[PDB]
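Assemble and predict.
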Amino acid sequence: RQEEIEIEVVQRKKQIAVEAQEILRTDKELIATVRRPAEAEAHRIQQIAE
Amino acid sequence: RQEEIEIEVVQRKKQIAVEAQEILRTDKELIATVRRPAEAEAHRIQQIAE
Amino acid sequence: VAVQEQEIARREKELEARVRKPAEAERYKLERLAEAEKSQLIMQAEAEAASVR
């Protein structure tokens, strides 16, 4: 059982490296889904205001 | 799986070049559907006003 | 991550054609259509004024 529970430990040890890529993925995803679309929506206003 | 997900990467790499032509297409399309028709509609007014 | 690092360059082109270009076309339409509305109202004003005098 010491060796069996160690399987869970190495899984967590790797899951940490998975979530490290998840942050980076979520960051780029927010640039494409939030930051850039909002910047486009703001330009419409500056044009239709004229 | 590193090679499989690379297929999606090269697809995106090309999709960028597709949308680059899409901007240019949409630009010319707006000249024919909006800018020129509006310029014609404005001339009617200047004539029927006389 | 590499796939979404290209999705950025994608939206940056899609939004230019979907969001920016048509809003810019609408601005030009509104401006040249406004000149026509003004032109008709000044000509009509002159007609009503002449008809009164």
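The longest helix of chain B spans residues 2-48.
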